[PDB]
Design a protein around this ligand. Structure first.
Ligand SMILES: CCCCCCCCCCCCCCCCCC(=O)OC[C@H](COP(=O)([O-])OCC(O)COP(=O)([O-])OC[C@@H](COC(=O)CCCCCCCCCCCCCCCCC)OC(=O)CCCCCCCCCCCCCCCCC)OC(=O)CCCCCCCCCCCCCCCCC
Ligand SMILES: CCCCCCCCCCCCCCCCCC(=O)OC[C@H](COP(=O)(O)OCCN)OC(=O)CCCCCCCCCCCCCCCCC
Ligand SMILES: CCCCCCCCCCCCCCCCCC(=O)OC[C@H](COP(=O)(O)OCCN)OC(=O)CCCCCCCCCCCCCCCCC
Ligand SMILES: CCCCCCCCCCCCCCCCCC(=O)OC[C@H](COP(=O)(O)OCCN)OC(=O)CCCCCCCCCCCCCCCCC
Ligand SMILES: CCCCCCCCCCCCCCCCCC(=O)O[C@@H](COC(=O)CCCCCCCCCCCCCCC)COP(=O)(O)OC[C@H](O)CO
Ligand SMILES: Nc1nc2c(ncn2[C@@H]2O[C@H](COP(=O)(O)OP(=O)(O)OP(=O)(O)O)[C@@H](O)[C@H]2O)c(=O)[nH]1
Lengths: 139, 49, 99, 26, 459, 320, 57, 347, 63, 120
């Protein structure tokens, strides 16, 4: 997970450009994966609009990835609180708002604001405490 | 009587049912003796009697 | 006619078949017997004796035993002049407080 | 009597998918 | 212990194998008999709970609820043999089977000694109630109603499952005594809050607090009479029993994390009681009233004060008996008018004079009029809450002020006033309905003489 | 035992029993045309099993004592009622046709079951393949709504596809003025009021549809009234075919074993008849359907499985 | 007096009562396994009386 | 198909699965998979309808591809270790290689796309065999090689199995497609615990076996394939719809019914393995299965859907089937929670 | 009955629960411990038996 | 996990050395529940076949109780075996590994400093 390792290596609220670059790379790769799937299961009748479909998906996912990159890092920089889970929460909601902008609907943006912001807090909760999702076999 | 034809289970299938009692009493008499033989062998093996 | 269904049945009045109807079931004799059960095995054996049973239940929560101990304990304590109930509970003399 | 399902409820559960769309319309 | 369980389950073969028309009789006989035996369990010692075995034990909290559930069991049979008379014997037997199977689970969970054992039949009560609400419910939206009631509790219960097994792998056994004696100070680490949230939300859902309560109006209204009573008089109270039991290992985390629920509950009771002031449906109005009383217990349990627990157990029972009665009031009126709108049948007192009385102490009991057990509950809780903070009495007393208006609001709209001209099917009340109503009110005033029975282990 | 898979494995075949007297001959024609009379004569003169026309209570005839059960308990439709008001709002017309289609479809299975289990040919009146002539007739004057056709067809492909066509079909050709002649002599006031149009509309659908498209898979011989009464002439005509077209002169023991599987299971043969497509004439609501089912269940004999009803005298219930 | 039928229709009434007397049996059987600290806790442990051998059953 | 031919075809399919579970040599493991495949297709071809031909073709293409892809995992392990013994293998790429190779046979990940469609095309009895017996053989290999698995890779495959398997189930009318989506969801539950402790992977298997035998043979007894067709069965035989709703509730996992026993033990194990987020999410997705479970239960017996006048013939006749082992199936599939500590027998 | 019955009986309940509680905590520790080290009775993952080794002289000395 | 312990002969439902354990008593509460399952199958068995449930084929459900009881009984002995086996080699391990199981110090609650949080 070297690409994911980039985000973890950069200290929170420090070198915001690096964190934004690391974050948008995560979003871009994630958008590419889902876009490639969508092309597969759903046939893009003409090739050119197929590149349009994957362009939209990648552009969106990068935007959420990028916007969460700044908002998380600058908030920790501004408030001098790197451990605070709220840093990701505002960033999570900020990312959710960008999704609403891309889909042009307040309701979906509001829904993405709450859910992504909550998850963004939770993942930071896990990083601080030490939560493991894919725990190795211990017993 | 009511149904004009003798339905397949309308008569007591004597050969089959008599088997069912036969196996069940076998199934039981095996169990009690199996419980019995397990008991004193466990007692003898673990000391006791 | 949408579906071949039946019209909504009309709520029968148990009274107009038998004026003494008690509303427990249609048949009069069991209805009268249901009266006996619901009252005899309701009010009679549960509310009356059950109340007396719980009312005359033996000492619950030791509400009076503690009183008698307190009277004896308080009578002991002020007789010697020491305070009638210490501010401390687990005697500090044994306590081995860290540093 | 208590309400029971009718052709409105049945056709709600009838078809290719109870959650339909234009793609699944045909 | 066993002296209640086997009689309850052995009651099931009786109903199935009884005569065609005697089902209601013999079931009612021994359901009341079971109540008598349960009352023998009501006795409690000083401090040690009445412990029976590794599998079952009772304390001063479980016993009052146990006798309440067994006491309830005859009442649904009494309340249901009017809208199920025109049904096939098998379905009647199945209906009775559901109730006692439900009631059997209630004895099990309240007497359970292990939290997981408490947990297994904690949701197992849902299956019989789901059948009762769905199959024998008399409405259309009961289907969506059952789904709302089922999914809400599961959505809260499953986190408890993950939380509970985590306790087992970390602190050995989950025996209620072994937890209480080996309690350790829960830390403030950010995992312990999610620890705290999971151990609490499960009991939150089936104890409707503001926000997590929309299932109750849909649960109560579309449910049949027997379903409504069992759901409102015991089912909303498994959550209550859990909190008094499970908050042993949630301190001092309960001290700081209690705030969002306390504000939600204290404000919610004002909001919910306000809904009661303008409810078009009589059953819904009673249902929302249960939210207000239950939300009061939320503050009661979550303050974690000796007095607060005591008043909780007082409102624990008194609300259940009262809410069951009011649902009986609505049911006894419903089939005569075949509608649920309150203003449909006004001026019932001039037509049915005794029901005017039965509705009257019923409204007074819900009013927390002293010395009814409801007043002992609310008044005890107010003092405990007031010690916690002086401001809350503004919220606390306001609820009583709102509780007054809507309680007599149903009284004036239905009982008093001018009788409706058009209706002409209102027959003189069957003495079954009358007998059942006294079956509810009479033990309530009988309990007034001995609050100590239902005050709880904190007493 | 039955034709269960153990029977076929142990040696129970189907081609051994059947012989040249194994045919699915159907005597058929217009209303009251005397087809049933000719069908009996063919049955007697060939030693060939006869099947009378399947009425509303034909299913009732098969089950229990064979006593026709109540119309409410079996049919929810009356042919005499259909005569009075063919376009009644209750849907007596289509309910009559659909129930009749099921009854003859059951009759078709009973014929095949006896034929395959005995090798003796079967003669029946108005095989299910010819049942459409009435529905077509009941559709021309609007006795049923248009949608009844599609549902009746929808049942037809999902059922009649597996049941293979007869060997030779006997047709009693009878002109409408003749049909308008006898039905007065019948006397039953319900069948006097049959429209000449209905007798016409069955005829052409019988003529231009039933005979030609179905002729390519079995022999068709047309007889008017005189050649209908001549039992001697028709019977040797029936014997004087090779019977090449049709699936029957192609299958082996494999299909017949499978065919007797479906036919022996009396639930399966009409399983697709209770198709879940909803239309007002045939759909019955939950309350009415449930109450009737209780009324059906409380009847003697039907309370439990056959041979398991103590009321009729099923002794040894505790041992069966 | 019709006893061939009062038994058939009223034999159900004995089910729960024997269930209760049964329920006491397992209640008074399960406690035997729970003997363990019988007259052992120093709060209640005391000198055993001349004739009885078990303080609490 | 001749019953003697049918019996032999099933006999080889059973033996092929039996061969897999009893082989210490990787080649023989492959032999069992292919010859089980070699006799699975004709059973799906028993009805011989164009839908079945589409179903059988789909089933063969995915299974043959997975089995052929399985060979390289053996060959690569051979190449780097020279060991044909089925044990902890010695190559991460080979370990990765077979894990999706076996997963496609089970159909957990997007690989699962063949599972629903093949069940739709083929008959109810064949679907019962495909979704119950044909899942023992791929599971047998995973149990033996569980110690070598990458935890991240397998847990993911399990996650999307319950995730997608439960999610699409809300949008299925045909009961056959509902069962397959349930199967994919249940596939995740066993596979998730597989790296941690294999004992209750088996425990989930026999239990999940019990309902699927219970449900499918109930459905066969009903002779219904659609939700509406199932709804009409209340009129004919209301009792069967009653048991089906018990199993529907049980298979959903509500306590104290049997279906709660696997999930409860699964959550307990990974909780012991410090994985506590992972169990919680699967439990949340478990309600997704319960929804269309309730929808079927609502349509089957909890409510009373309209019937058709043509149902009256069905009353007169009776069922000729013998539904062997159905009585003990549902009882063993609905109330066995009190006998939970018997799982140590599997160990 | 007397409070002595409930007092002594509950003491036995606590004694049984305590031993059960500590055993489970030991069981999770041992299961973790012997899974890692592997020098334990269970968790012994299969190996290849040394019996299946051909010790007879081969056709080539270098063996 | 006991998947490869030394001595496990494969396909052995009840190994011989398991006989050194107290056999399940013939009326073990677990066993009678197993007998319950056999009966509960019997009642529904007549239900599907539409027979007089309780009083229908006394032979049929009688065999069900017998079959479930025996298959239950042997299961219980096997179940008791593993739990005894699981505890046995457990104890043999901890004596063999004293260093990994320190004896925690004996301090009464008097010396333990457990901070107190008021409820206020
Ligand atoms: C753990 C606890 C739970 C599990 C407990 C263990 C039992 C599990 C199975 C229970 C019963 C299942 C069942 O039959 O359901 C009805 C269900 C439908 O029955 P049906 O409605 O009669 O229709 C079946 C055919 O379509 C009808 O076609 P037909 O008309 O041609 O009749 C053929 C039928 C009729 O029988 C015969 O013809 C007998 C054979 C005669 C020729 C050969 C004779 C010489 C060889 C004999 C071998 C025996 O024979 C067979 O179907 C052959 C298979 C059975 C015999 C061979 C068994 C393997 C050897 O059965 C099937 O669909 C059969 C599927 C294959 C077997 C079950 C597979 C599912 C279970 C797998 C997991 C088992 C546990 C693993 C751990
Ligand atoms: C783990 C991988 C699971 C793959 C499952 C593929 C089938 C289900 C997903 C699907 O068909 O589409 C989901 C996604 C977005 O689809 P979308 O472009 O929004 O179109 C929806 C309306 N046709 O299209 C996809 O292909 C994305 C699926 C993976 C998302 C992560
Ligand atoms: C701290 C390190 C990380 C820092 C950066 C933050 C994380 C990475 C950036 C955010 C990633 C999650 C947000 C969603 C990204 C993908 C969005 C996407 O695919 O949008 C397209 C589409 C939604 O639109 P649609 O429904 O198709 O409607 C329009 C139809 N014409 O999509 C669909 O239709 C399908 C549904 C959405 C796609 C499936 C779910 C994708 C996300 C899964 C979790 C990813 C987690 C990444 C981070 C952790 C792992 C590295
Ligand atoms: C865990 C929670 C509960 C889970 C399970 C819940 C199941 C039901 C849930 C609701 C289901 C949907 C709604 C109801 C559907 C009803 C289905 C049905 O078919 O109903 C009608 C039917 C008519 O009855 P019938 O089949 O004629 O049989 C009568 C008895 N011979 O009725 C029947 O077919 C029912 C027949 C029942 C027969 C019962 C026999 C009882 C025998 C008891 C013996 C006791 C012996 C005691 C011995 C003591 C000493 C040892
Ligand atoms: C509808 C949504 C849910 C409704 C509300 C329910 C309650 C909200 C919170 C739900 C929590 C569920 C998971 C909690 C399980 C038990 C928690 C527990 O025992 O505490 C652990 C808390 O640890 C956790 O990580 C628990 C989970 C935290 C929350 C993240 C997952 C749950 C939320 C998302 C899934 C559920 C939401 C619905 C999704 C559809 C302690 O472990 P630890 O982390 O201290 O372990 C030692 C070391 O630090 C490393 O492990
Ligand atoms: N819809 C419908 N009506 C039928 C069918 N078979 C007979 N009928 C009706 O049955 C009535 C009398 O039976 P017919 O066979 O036409 O006349 P019949 O006087 O009995 O004399 P035969 O024709 O010799 O049997 C007429 O109203 C027919 O339309 C059938 O398959 N479908």
């Amino acid at each position: 997970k070297t690409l994911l390792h980039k985000y973890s290596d950069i200290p929170e609220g420090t070198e915001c450009h690096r964190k934004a670059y690391a974050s948008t790379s995560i979003g871009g790769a994630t958008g590419l994966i889902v876009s490639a799937y969508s092309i597969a299961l759903k046939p893009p009748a003409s090739f050119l609009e197929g590149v349009a479909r994957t362009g939209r998906y990648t552009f969106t996912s990068a935007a959420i990835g990028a916007i969460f990159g700044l908002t998380s890092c600058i908030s920790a920089q501004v408030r001098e609180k790197p451990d605070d889970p709220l840093n990701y929460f505002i960033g999570g909601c900020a990312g959710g708002l960008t999704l609403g902008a891309r889909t042009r609907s307040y309701g979906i943006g509001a829904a993405a604001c709450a859910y992504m912001g909550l998850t963004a807090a939770l993942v930071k909760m896990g990083q601080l405490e030490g939560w493991q999702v894919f725990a190795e076999p211990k017993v | 009587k009511f149904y004009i034809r003798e339905p397949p289970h309308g008569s007591p299938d004597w050969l089959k049912v008599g088997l069912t009692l036969g196996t069940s009493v076998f199934l039981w008499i095996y169990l009690i003796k199996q419980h019995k033989e397990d008991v004193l062998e466990y007692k003898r093996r673990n000391g006791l009697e | 006619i949408r579906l071949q269904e039946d019209p909504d049945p009309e709520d029968e009045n148990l009274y107009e078949k038998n004026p003494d109807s008690h509303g427990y079931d249609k048949d009069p004799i069991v209805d009268l017997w249901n009266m006996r059960v619901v009252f005899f095995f309701g009010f009679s054996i549960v509310l009356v004796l059950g109340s007396t049973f719980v009312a005359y239940l033996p000492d619950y929560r030791m509400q009076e035993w503690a009183r008698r101990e307190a009277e004896r304990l308080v009578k002991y304590r002020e007789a010697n002049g020491l305070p009638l109930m210490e501010s401390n509970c687990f005697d500090p003399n044994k306590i081995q407080l860290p540093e | 009597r208590q309400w029971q399902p009718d052709v409105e409820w049945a056709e709600q559960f009838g078809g290719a998918v109870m959650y339909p769309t234009k793609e699944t319309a045909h | 212990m066993l002296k209640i369980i086997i009689p309850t389950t052995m009651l099931l073969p009786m109903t199935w194998m009884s005569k065609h028309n005697m089902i209601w009789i013999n079931a009612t006989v021994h359901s009341l008999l079971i109540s008598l035996i349960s009352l023998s369990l009501l006795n409690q010692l000083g401090e040690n709970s009445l412990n029976f075995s590794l599998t079952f034990f009772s304390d001063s909290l479980s016993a009052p609820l146990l006798v309440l559930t067994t006491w309830l069991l005859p009442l649904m049979l009494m309340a249901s043999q009017s809208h199920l008379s025109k049904e096939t014997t098998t379905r009647k037997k199945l209906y009775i089977t559901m109730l006692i199977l439900l009631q059997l689970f209630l004895i099990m969970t309240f007497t359970a000694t292990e939290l997981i054992l408490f947990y297994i039949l904690f949701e197992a009560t849902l299956v019989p109630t789901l059948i009762i609400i769905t199959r024998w419910g008399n409405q259309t939206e009961r289907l969506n109603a059952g789904l709302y009631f089922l999914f809400y509790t599961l959505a809260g219960s499953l986190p408890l499952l993950v939380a509970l097994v985590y306790i087992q792998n970390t602190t050995g056994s989950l025996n209620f005594l072994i937890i209480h004696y080996w309690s350790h100070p829960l830390s403030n680490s950010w995992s312990n809050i999610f620890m705290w949230l999971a151990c609490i939300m499960a009991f939150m859902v089936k104890m409707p607090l503001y926000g997590l309560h929309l299932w109750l109006p849909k649960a109560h209204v579309e449910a049949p009479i027997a379903g409504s009573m069992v759901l409102a008089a015991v089912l909303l109270k498994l959550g209550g029993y859990g909190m008094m039991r499970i908050t042993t290992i949630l301190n001092p985390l309960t001290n700081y994390m209690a705030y969002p629920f306390l504000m939600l509950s204290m404000w919610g009771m004002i909001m919910t009681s306000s809904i009661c002031l303008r409810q078009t449906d009589l059953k819904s109005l009673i249902a929302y009233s249960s939210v207000s009383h239950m939300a009061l217990v939320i503050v009661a349990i979550m303050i974690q004060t000796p007095w607060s627990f005591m008043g909780a157990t007082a409102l624990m029972i008194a609300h259940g008996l009262t809410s069951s009665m009011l649902f009986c009031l609505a049911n006894t009126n419903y089939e005569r008018v075949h509608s649920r709108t309150m203003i449909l049948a006004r001026g019932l007192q001039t037509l049915l004079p005794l029901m005017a009385t039965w509705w009257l102490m019923a409204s007074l009991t819900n009013l927390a009029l002293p010395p009814s057990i409801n007043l002992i509950g609310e008044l005890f809780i107010i003092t405990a809450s007031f010690s916690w903070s002086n401001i809350t009495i503004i919220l606390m007393g306001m609820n009583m002020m709102i509780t007054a208006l809507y309680s007599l609001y149903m009284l004036i709209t239905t009982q008093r006033g001018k009788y409706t001209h058009h209706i002409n099917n209102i027959k003189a009340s069957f003495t079954r309905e009358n007998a059942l109503m006294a079956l509810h009110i009479l033990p309530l005033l009988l309990l007034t003489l001995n609050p100590k029975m239902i005050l709880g282990p904190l007493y | 035992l039955q034709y269960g898979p153990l029977a076929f494995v142990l040696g129970e075949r189907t081609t051994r029993k059947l012989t040249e007297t194994s045919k699915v001959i159907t005597v058929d024609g217009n209303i009251c045309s005397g087809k049933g009379r000719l069908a009996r004569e063919i049955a007697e003169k060939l030693g060939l099993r006869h099947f009378p026309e399947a009425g509303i209570h034909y299913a009732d005839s098969t089950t229990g004592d064979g006593k026709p059960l109540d119309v409410q308990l079996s049919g929810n439709c009356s042919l005499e009622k259909f005569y009075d008001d063919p376009k009644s709002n209750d849907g007596n017309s289509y309910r009559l046709q659909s129930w009749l289609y099921a009854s003859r479809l059951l009759q078709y299975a009973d014929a095949l079951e006896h034929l395959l289990s005995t090798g003796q040919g079967v003669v029946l009146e108005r095989s299910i393949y010819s049942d459409f002539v009435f529905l077509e007739a009941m559709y021309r004057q609007g006795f049923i709504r248009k949608q009844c056709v599609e549902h009746y067809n929808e049942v037809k492909k999902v059922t009649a596809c597996e049941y293979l066509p007869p060997h030779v079909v006997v047709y009693v050709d009878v002109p409408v003025p003749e049909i308008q002649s006898r039905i007065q002599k019948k006397g039953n006031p319900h069948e006097m009021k049959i429209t000449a149009a209905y007798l016409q509309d069955i005829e052409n659908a019988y003529k231009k549809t039933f005979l030609p498209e179905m002729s390519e898979k079995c022999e068709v011989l047309q007889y008017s009234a005189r050649e209908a009464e001549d039992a001697e002439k028709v019977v040797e005509d029936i014997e004087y075919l090779k019977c090449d077209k049709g699936p029957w002169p192609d299958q082996d023991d494999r299909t017949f074993h499978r065919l007797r599987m479906l036919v022996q299971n009396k639930l399966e043969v009409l399983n697709y008849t209770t198709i879940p497509v909803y239309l007002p004439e045939i759909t019955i609501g939950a309350h009415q359907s449930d109450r009737v089912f209780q009324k059906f269940t409380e009847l003697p004999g039907r309370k439990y499985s056959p041979g398991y009803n103590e009321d009729v005298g099923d002794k040894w219930i505790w041992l069966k | 007096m019709n006893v061939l039928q009062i038994v058939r229709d009223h034999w159900v009434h004995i089910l729960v009562p024997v269930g209760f007397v049964f329920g006491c049996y397992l209640d008074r059987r399960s406690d035997e396994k729970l003997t363990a600290f019988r007259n052992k806790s120093l709060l209640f442990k005391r000198e055993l009386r001349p004739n009885e051998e078990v303080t609490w059953k | 198909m001749n019953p003697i031919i049918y019996t032999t075809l099933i006999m080889t399919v059973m033996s092929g699965t039996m061969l897999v579970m009893i082989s210490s040599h990787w080649l023989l493991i492959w032999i069992g998979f292919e010859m089980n495949l070699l006799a699975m297709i004709p059973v799906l071809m028993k009805n011989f309808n164009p839908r079945a031909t589409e179903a059988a073709t789909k089933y063969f293409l995915t299974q043959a591809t997975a089995s052929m892809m399985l060979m390289m995992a053996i060959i690569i392990n051979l190449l780097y270790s020279g060991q044909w013994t089925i044990t902890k293998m010695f190559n991460p790429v080979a370990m990765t290689m077979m894990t999706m190779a076996l997963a496609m046979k089970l159909g957990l990940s997007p690989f699962h796309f063949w599972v629903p469609e093949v069940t739709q095309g083929i008959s109810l009895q064949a679907g019962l065999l495909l979704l119950t017996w044909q899942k023992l053989a791929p599971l047998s290999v995973l149990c033996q090689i569980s110690q070598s698995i990458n935890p991240n890779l397998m847990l993911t495959m399990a996650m999307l199995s319950i995730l997608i398997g439960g999610w699409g189930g809300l949008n299925q009318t045909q009961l056959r497609k509902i069962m397959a989506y349930s199967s994919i969801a249940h596939m995740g539950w066993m596979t998730a615990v597989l790296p941690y402790n294999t004992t209750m992977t088996i425990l989930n298997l026999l239990i999940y076996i019990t309902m699927t035998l219970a449900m499918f043979m109930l459905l066969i007894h009903s002779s219904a394939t659609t939700t509406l067709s199932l709804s009409h069965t209340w009129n004919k035989m209301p009792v069967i719809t009653s048991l089906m709703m018990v199993t529907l509730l049980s298979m959903g996992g509500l306590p104290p019914l049997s279906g709660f026993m696997p999930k409860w033990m699964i959550i307990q194990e990974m909780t012991k393995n410090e994985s506590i987020i992972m169990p919680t999410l699967m439990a949340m997705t478990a309600l997704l299965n319960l929804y269309f479970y309730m929808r079927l239960a609502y349509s089957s017996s909890l409510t009373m859907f309209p019937s058709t006048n043509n149902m009256k013939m069905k009353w007169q006749f009776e069922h000729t089937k013998q539904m062997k082992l159905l009585p003990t199936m549902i009882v063993l599939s609905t109330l066995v929670l009190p006998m939970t500590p018997a799982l140590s027998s599997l160990n | 009955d007397g409070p002595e019955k409930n007092y002594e009986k509950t003491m036995a309940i606590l004694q049984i629960e305590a031993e059960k509680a500590e055993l489970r905590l030991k069981e999770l520790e041992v299961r973790r411990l012997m899974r890692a080290r592997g020098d334990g009775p269970w968790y012994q993952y299969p190996t290849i038996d040394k019996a299946l080794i051909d010790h007879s002289p081969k056709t080539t000395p270098d063996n | 996990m006991m998947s490869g312990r030394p001595g496990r002969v494969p396909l052995q439902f009840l190994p011989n050395e398991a006989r050194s354990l107290p056999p399940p008593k013939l009326t073990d509460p677990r066993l009678v529940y197993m007998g319950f399952l056999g009966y509960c199958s019997g009642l529904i068995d007549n239900a599907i076949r539409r027979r007089p449930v309780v009083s229908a084929g006394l032979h049929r459900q009688l065999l069900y109780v017998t079959s479930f009881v025996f298959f239950g009984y042997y299961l219980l002995k096997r179940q008791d075996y593993m739990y005894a086996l699981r505890d046995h080699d457990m104890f043999a391990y901890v004596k063999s590994h004293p260093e990994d199981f320190p004896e925690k110090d004996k301090k009464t609650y008097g010396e333990i400093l457990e901070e107190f949080h008021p409820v206020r």
